Amino acid sequence: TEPEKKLELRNVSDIELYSQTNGTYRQHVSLDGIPENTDTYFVKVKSSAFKDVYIPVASITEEKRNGQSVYKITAKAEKLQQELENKYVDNFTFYLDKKAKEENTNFTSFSNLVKAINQNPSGTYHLAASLNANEVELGPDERSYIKDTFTGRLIGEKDGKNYAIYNLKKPLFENLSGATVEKLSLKNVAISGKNDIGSLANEATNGTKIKQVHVDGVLAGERGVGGLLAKADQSSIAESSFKGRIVNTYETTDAYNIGGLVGHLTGKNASIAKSKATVTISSNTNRSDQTVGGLAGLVDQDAHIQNSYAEGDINNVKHFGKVAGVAGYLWDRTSGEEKHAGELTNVLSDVNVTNGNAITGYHYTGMKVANTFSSKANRVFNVTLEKDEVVSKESFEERGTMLDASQIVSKKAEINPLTLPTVEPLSFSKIAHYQANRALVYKNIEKLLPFYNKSTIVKYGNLVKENSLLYQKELLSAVMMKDDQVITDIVSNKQTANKLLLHYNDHSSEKFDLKYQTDFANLAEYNLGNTGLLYTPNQFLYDRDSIVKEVLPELQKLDYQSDAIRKTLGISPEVKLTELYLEDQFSKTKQNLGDSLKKLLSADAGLAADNSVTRGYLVDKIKNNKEALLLGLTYLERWYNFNYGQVNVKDLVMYHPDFFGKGNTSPLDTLIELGKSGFNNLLAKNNVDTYGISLASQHGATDLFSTLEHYRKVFLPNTSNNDWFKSETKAYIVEEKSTIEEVKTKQGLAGTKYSIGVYDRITSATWKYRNMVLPLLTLPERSVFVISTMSSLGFGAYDRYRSSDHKAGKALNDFVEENARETAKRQRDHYDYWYRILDEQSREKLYRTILLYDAYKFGDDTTSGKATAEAKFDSSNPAMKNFFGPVGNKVVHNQHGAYATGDGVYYMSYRMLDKDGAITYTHEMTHDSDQDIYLGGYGRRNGLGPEFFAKGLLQAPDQPSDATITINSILKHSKSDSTEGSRLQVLDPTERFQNAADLQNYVHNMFDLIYMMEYLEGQSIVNKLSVYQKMAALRKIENKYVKDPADGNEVYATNVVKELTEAEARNLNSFESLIDHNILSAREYQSGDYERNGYYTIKLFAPIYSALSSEKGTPGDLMGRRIAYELLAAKGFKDGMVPYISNQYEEDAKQQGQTINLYGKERGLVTDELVLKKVFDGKYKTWAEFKTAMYQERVDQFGNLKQVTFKDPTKPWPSYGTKTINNVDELQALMDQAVLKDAEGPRWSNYDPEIDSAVHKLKRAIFKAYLDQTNDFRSSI
Secondary structure: OOOOOOEEOOOEEEEEEEEOOOOOOEEOOOOOOOOOOOOOOEEEEEEOOOOOEEEEEEEEEEEEOOOOEEEEEEEOOOOEEEEEOOEEEOOEEEEEOOOOOOOOOOOOOHHHHHHHHHHOOOOEEEOOOOEEOOOOOOOOOOOOOOOOOOOOOEEEOOOOOOOEEEOEOOOOOOEEOOOEEEOOEEEEEEEEEOOOEEOOEEEEOOOOEEEOOEEEEEEEEOOOEEOOEEEEOOOEEEOOEEOOOEEEOOOOOOOOEEEOOEOOEOOOOOEEEOOEEOOEEEEOOOOOOOEEOOOOOOEOOOOEEEOOEEOOEEEOOOOOOEEEOOEOOOOOOOOOOHHHHOEEEOEEEOOOOEOOEOOEOOOOOOOOOOOEEEOOOOOEEEOOOOOOOEEEOOOOOEOOOOOOOOHHHOOOOOOOOOOOOOOOOOOOOOOOOOOOOOHHHHHHHHOOOOOOOHHHHHHHHOOOOOOOOOOOOEOOOEEEOOOOOOOOHHHHOOOOOOEEEEEEOOOOEEEEEEEOOOOOOOOOOEEEHHHOEEEOOOOOOOOHHHHHHHHHHHHHOOOOOOHHHHHHOOOOOOOOOOOOOOHHHHHHHHHOHHHHHHHHHHHHOEEOOOOHHHHHHHHHHHHHOHHHHHHHHHHHHHHOOOEEOOEEOHHHHHOOOOOOOOOOOOHHHHHHHHHOOOOOOOOHHHHHHHHHHHHOOOOOOOOHHHHHHHHHHHOOOOOOHHHHHHHHOOOEEEEEOOOOHHHHHHHHOOOOOOOOOHHHHHOOOOOOOHHHHHHHHOOOOOOEEEEEEOOOEEEEEHHHOOOOOOOOOOHHHHHHHHHHHHHHHHHHHHHHHHHHHOOOOOHHHOOOOOEEEOOOOOOOOOOOOOOOOOOOOOOOOHHHHHOOOOOOOOOOOOOOOEEEOOOOEEEOOOOOOOHHHHHHHHHHHHHHOHHHHHOOOOOOOOOOOOOHHHHOOOOOOOOOOOOEOOOOOOOOOOOOOHHHOOOOOOOOOOOOOOOHHHHHHHHHHHHHHHHHHHHHHHHHHHHOOOHHHHHHHEEEEEEEEOOOOOOOOOOEEEEEEEOOOHHHHHHOOOHHHHHHOOEEEOOOOOOOOOOOOOOOOOEOOOOOOOOOOOOOOEOOOHHHHHHHHHHHHHOOHHHHHHHHHOOOOHHHHHHHOOEEEEOOEEEEOOOHHHHHHHHOOOOOOOHHHHHHHHHHHHHHHHOOOOOOOOOOOOOOOOOOOOOOOOOHHHHHHHHHHHHHHHHOOOOOOOOOOOOOOHHHHHHHHHHHHHHHHOOOOOOOO
């Protein structure tokens, strides 16, 4: 008893009735009245299993269901069989209800809510369930859904649990006046508007008791943004919450008060109590009157913020406006009283604000902030004065990391809001032929035969065999012709489509052969290999040409700079569309609109109608939203056209939304939703967030990265996702795994916090610019290079190195490639060294990723050198158009200098690839991660600033011939080069330094030689030098305590070098007196006073006999680095140098009694006396004793064992072969003669007394001779 095959609608979720009476289609949901005279209606059946179907009506009549006017409507189709009351009818017949009396109030639905509120705004209203706001038609330019003044007077939700208004796109109440909204929640807000915007309402004129309002979602505005209310006048918000993005990156130049919770607090009794705002707010001030305050912002007229909490992130581009973490411009425009300004109390803000303060932007004497709190986070300030510099703000109260302990400021957290309408699938049993074991198989074949009878389904399911792979759960398949993902069926149905890719729930792809076997004009059919299973496309092959010939000409006449596009987007005529970066792809999609539009009409919905009503409905839907459709088509094609092998997902993402499941969505609906979503949603910078909002939750995927991983699992299996990333992208990706076997094995894995792959780092969380993946997938040419090494991720452009010497093609590419490879190798060697040195298990934290952008200063071929043309945006350079621009990271980009913002490093002048790029690389890296990486784990010393640990301490030397005490961690220079002359540095890093003990031994031997030479020079000073010569030859260094702006205490000491008096000069007759009187050589150290946080490095050959022990908190800079290197010579890096500069002995000071008020909190003060008494408890009591004992040890050493193989020429251009110093006595005699020669007839003009001075020549010659004697500094005895 084989059954017949007909078309059948199974999972009929709901049914709708549309009309064409007035030439415009509308929803005749209820009150059809008398049966209509003419039948131009068409029934739209929406299914939970597959997409909707439009079928023309046949007969509309009235039938008494139970003595009521319930209209029965029967639709006309080819062979449509409907299973009604367990029996089959040859036509789809359904009943329509009369009406539902729910419009008397606003309980049920939002569509009824906007109607009910407008009737009488005053009163009391309660929500009945979680209601979706997608039912309202938004409006062309409507400000808010509810337009009355005072609305929602008592709109509470205490009737049942808590109900949330899902999917908001405009302000809810527009205005509020003496109206109390309480217990209301907003879950997915996407508000975008030109004027002032507010999630709850735009203004609160009178006493609006806002309570228990938790709003979540992204808010984008231009003229002004607000978290809950754009302006609160005499209104109080208590126990409210916000948790969404806030963007105001537009180039507006007006007075806006953007705030994460409320825009403007102007009321006398206005108050914010027990409120929290997790606002990852980004904004561009561009003018001083602007204010970005997170919580509130520009608080005025005694409005008091009590018990608030700000945990978001503020990313201000420039510090022009008054931006702060928890309170913006507390000052008022009128008289500046302490009380009239505003009040803060018991407030906390652990917000990573940039370019601004952590608490209040404008700080004055009569401060009314009272009690404030802030944690240890980034508060960087780009002063952009001359060379770009970044410093901390220091204008907040500082606390520890125990934020959860101090989280009792706001006890209220959040509430569990009820979910929206589920509308499940509600999934046949007891058919003609049924088997229990093959149940799932039936479902597995239902995706293969849509619009078919259940009898045919089970008949074909019985034909499935166990050997085949149809026994796993199967998602929707994709028909393809030789890896093409064909969509336009009516064009490619006659041609036998080659393959059908079944995508199973195991993320497995299985290819079956297809042939146009059984041919129906109504619905195409196909056969699947030898199994005999039938496959049919989910489209009725209607006349697409009738729709195309109509809709194509109107869509063709559109311009990117037209007013229609600007009106469809949320753009004011002032701001430009350059941030979209879709003009080229706009034109491209404009030319070939035919193919894409045919694919869209093919994948949209199944038209089983020969009557022109359904095709007219499609035409109207495509025409009414032409601008939005075209913008969506441009955006989806621009950023989603990357190939998995030979399969391009431009057709599988834009169309075929059922590949992951969820066939209920329509590819046309998502395009319209993406087009009209706004300017910020279509923005290129938010490509990762746009997917989650528009594309996701509709294609069946959670996020963009999960979608990419899913497509990599389906297409191109058994290959790592990072490998596919490296293969597909057109950026030159260079990865260098460290030489150490342990870290080399650790990096190979795909694990987070350890993988070196570019995709594993970019797509990971806690990455600032994770939106850099989608543009990088779409690079047309080798325009950008990605240097991804351990603990780094540098992005650079090829146009940065293009100049007169390097032509635009062939030469620039090769040069950039080779130099990038060498720079990756150098960075890898540097981090290999730093991994070998650090042995305190802090090396496991050397895997953090921080980007390394370049200058953006692209240079044309006409430019002689590296051009300084900033090229802000919209440049003709392909690197700026296809990258950097889309990954919009507005930088300062000055002419000279490099700065490390704390989360990344930027090269404004030094080119990253050049060999001078690494010497600045190590300095910027020391600036970036000195707090928790290079040090043992404790922060910087309180007095020492960021420039102290970098310029003279942990950095590679600027040049090889530089006579400075530094560690050559990066640059590798072979002996073959001409740089062998005056080496004075380490030959090969990562070979000399294999452990911390190796570094300690190297520094110990270097300072042994340095101490020998310095002792010889000192004995030359006291014994053979006159008084007048002694005065000029030496200087006296002291420590002067000056007031600093950041901290109140003046315990910090600054070094000062001064000309010593003749009275003190005469006393200098003993070498011990040189150490006691604190004297240093004037050959290389200037006579002016030094400053704190300065680029001061101690010279290698310029002696510093002074042991200027600063009994206070901080030694200084010139003396600090010298004593730190001496301590490193005495004890190891972790044992000696780290406790000196990393205040690890701070707590002990707090236990002793040494204290300091740091940022308003009592903290320990690590004095030099404590460091001396803890590092060397029994050996020494004073730093002078330590210096003297080091000198005495070196003396006892060189008095016995010194290598006679010392070869120093110290002669002019005529080559001098060998002086063969055999004992220290001849060397001391030569030093005496050199000092006497330098004293006699001193030039002291044109500066630079380091080359002409004969004393420096002898020291350099001896140093180079001893360095070249052994392989490296191993032992000098």
